UniProtKB/Swiss-Prot annotation, chain A:
The keyword Methyltransferase does not apply. The chain holds residues 1 to 191 of 377 of the full protein. Component of the 26S proteasome, a multiprotein complex involved in the ATP-dependent degradation of ubiquitinated proteins. This complex plays a key role in the maintenance of protein homeostasis by removing misfolded or damaged proteins, which could impair cellular functions, and by removing proteins whose functions are no longer required. Therefore, the proteasome participates in numerous cellular processes, including cell cycle progression, apoptosis, or DNA damage repair. GO terms for cellular component: cytosol; nucleoplasm; nucleus; proteasome accessory complex; proteasome complex; proteasome regulatory particle, base subcomplex. Keywords: Isopeptide bond, Phosphoprotein, Proteasome, Repeat, Ubl conjugation. GO terms for molecular function: identical protein binding; molecular adaptor activity; polyubiquitin modification-dependent protein binding; RNA binding. There is a cross-link at residue 122 (Glycyl lysine isopeptide (Lys-Gly) (interchain with G-Cter in SUMO2)). Belongs to the proteasome subunit S5A family. The 2 UIM motifs are involved in the binding to a multi-ubiquitin chain in a cooperative way. GO terms for biological process: proteasome-mediated ubiquitin-dependent protein catabolic process. This is 26S proteasome non-ATPase regulatory subunit 4. Component of the 19S proteasome regulatory particle complex. The 26S proteasome consists of a 20S core particle (CP) and two 19S regulatory subunits (RP). The regulatory particle is made of a lid composed of 9 subunits, a base containing 6 ATPases and few additional components including PSMD4. Interacts with NUB1. Interacts with SQSTM1. Interacts with UBQLN4. Interacts with UBE3A. Interacts with UBQLN1 (via ubiquitin-like domain). Interacts with DDI2. Residues 5-188 form the VWFA domain.
Curated annotation (Swiss-Prot), chain B:
The keyword Acetylation applies. Component of the 19S proteasome regulatory particle complex. The 26S proteasome consists of a 20S core particle (CP) and two 19S regulatory subunits (RP). The regulatory particle is made of a lid composed of 9 subunits including PSMD13, a base containing 6 ATPases and few additional components. The gene is PSMD13. The lineage of its organism: Eukaryota, Metazoa, Chordata, Craniata, Vertebrata. This is 26S proteasome non-ATPase regulatory subunit 13. Keywords: Acetylation, Proteasome. Component of the 26S proteasome, a multiprotein complex involved in the ATP-dependent degradation of ubiquitinated proteins. This complex plays a key role in the maintenance of protein homeostasis by removing misfolded or damaged proteins, which could impair cellular functions, and by removing proteins whose functions are no longer required. Therefore, the proteasome participates in numerous cellular processes, including cell cycle progression, apoptosis, or DNA damage repair.
From Swiss-Prot, chain C:
Component of the 19S proteasome regulatory particle complex. The 26S proteasome consists of a 20S core particle (CP) and two 19S regulatory subunits (RP). The regulatory particle is made of a lid composed of 9 subunits including PSMD7, a base containing 6 ATPases and few additional components. Within the complex, PSMD7 interacts with subunit PSMD4 through their respective MPN domain. Interacts with TRIM5. The chain holds residues 101 to 195 of 324 of the full protein. Component of the 26S proteasome, a multiprotein complex involved in the ATP-dependent degradation of ubiquitinated proteins. This complex plays a key role in the maintenance of protein homeostasis by removing misfolded or damaged proteins, which could impair cellular functions, and by removing proteins whose functions are no longer required. Therefore, the proteasome participates in numerous cellular processes, including cell cycle progression, apoptosis, or DNA damage repair. There is a cross-link at residue 80 (Glycyl lysine isopeptide (Lys-Gly) (interchain with G-Cter in ubiquitin)). It comes from the Eukaryota. This is 26S proteasome non-ATPase regulatory subunit 7. Does not bind a metal ion. Belongs to the peptidase M67A family.
Amino acid sequence: MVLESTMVCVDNSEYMRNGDFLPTRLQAQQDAVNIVCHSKTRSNPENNVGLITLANDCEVLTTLTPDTGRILSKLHTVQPKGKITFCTGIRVAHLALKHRQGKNHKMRIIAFVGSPVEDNEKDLVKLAKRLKKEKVNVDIINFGEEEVNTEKLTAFVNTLNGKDGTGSHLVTVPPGPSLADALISSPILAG
Amino acid sequence: VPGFLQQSQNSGPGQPAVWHRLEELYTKKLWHQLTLQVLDFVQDPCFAQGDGLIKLYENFISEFEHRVNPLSLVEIILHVVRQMTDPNVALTFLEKTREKVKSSDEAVILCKTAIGALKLNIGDLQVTKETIEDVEEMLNNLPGVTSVHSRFYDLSSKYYQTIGNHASYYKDALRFLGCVDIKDLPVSEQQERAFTLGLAGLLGEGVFNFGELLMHPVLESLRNTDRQWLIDTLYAFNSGNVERFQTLKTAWGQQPDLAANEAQLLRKIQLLCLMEMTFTRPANHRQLTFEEIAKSAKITVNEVELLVMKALSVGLVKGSIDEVDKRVHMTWVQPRVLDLQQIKGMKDRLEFWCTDVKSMEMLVEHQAHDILT
Amino acid sequence: LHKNDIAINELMKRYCPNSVLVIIDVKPKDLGLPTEAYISVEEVHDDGTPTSKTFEHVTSEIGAEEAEEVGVEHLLRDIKDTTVGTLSQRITNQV
């Protein structure tokens, strides 16, 4: 029953509004949230999961809670329209998990990126050294499209955990209309 | 449908690079690069022979489009009804678009501005007074779209061209000019825009200068490039002097709608000279007699009473009248924009009051301090 | 109040219809009256600002309750120069 507090970050960005994935991108990532919340529930019932977005504002829709009923409520009518927001997405998730109570639990976050981001490389490398000085591991599960063969996230995860980091990954998006279980079939094994 | 786009896809040389991109847009089921690329193919400056053909494919897009914001529907429908220009077949298509959209963004406002944009054809009185009214009541809780207020203000200015209205253009032009900073057009619209703003809003009722717009700093290049008789006569209205020369030079320049408004504007400056002759004098021994009114306003004896009671009726003076000397008593002055000497007089007289209050309070405190103890 | 002090009210307007705020000072260097209170209204301007959503102050004081009288008026025991009459107001007359 490993100790973390898994912070799911939903993807209600405007490029997620199409149907290049299976019915709708929203529904596939919603079932992805279902399988990761039950997977981390069976991984530990002690740890708890709140959600956050990358919309117009990174809103704390759910506080970090162990029950998934509010998760099931808030995955509906998500308004999937708005500019992506990443760089202060790290900051809002980090301070949201400094609003925890048991700080021996790992600040584990998952990020859902399905839109072209406009980050600066220096901003994300300040975030890289920041999260090195903040004891955080984030596995980023990419969705949709970006600048194709997604860029700055290879850079961010590479600058994140150099010299024996082994805790942060980058699940890039497969650009094929595949089943969502095939997208999570490697992240359900490990990072 | 793919053949329906192949047959109109063959369009010429070179341009088939993005036409052969278009034959891969719908295949990948992207609906935002497709949105921007419909915006590209319709924003495309041509005669646009293919939009009246591809609008059936736009219905085919609207079939399993099913989420995309109809701001792109506006950005296509402007060129679409610019190609159609038919008041019969486009109003029905307009009402179809009005009923087939239910998205979370306000689309009823863009439908009402489509009603207004096809009201550019005819019917500038029919249902205008009624259906303009609902739009700003739908413009609630987020005016920061600013496309909604632009497209609403355009039909609001069309409502100003419902001749018997004058202050509406001024009032909502201040709103539009507040929500636009650069007019993001080839500049030549701005000059006649601020020019007719000057004209029409100067022909307003309660407005006389309101020199916040005379110091409106994005029409300053316009005030340098407009024919500067208008800016100068606005400086005369701000200066409020009756001043027959430049207020006849505007009658030299602006011939239409100045003879019909001539006695009105001269009556307005005849009441405007009061709220400057009381502002020039330092507000202490300021009870004005008939003479300086009849000298500034250059009107006769038995009209200055009408002149002052008009301003008393409006409320841009709060005084009273004796008539044994025809002394009109002054208990009022207009709040006026702080200039450099006004800055200095502000700080100096404010300090003058402050140090006097302090110096007397210190004497009160020290005189009765040791009985407080 | 700083710039971010509108978003709190704009969150919890969905709890109280007029969610009023209170500005205090924990450091009593204020020789004025503490417990300032604002309220957010709109004043949409002649310049054509779309919506100016500004907090505006409504006046405030410290009220009374019978039990909290017992509490406060016992917790002081410190200063009483008033002998309420011609001189309970003169300290505040300097004020």
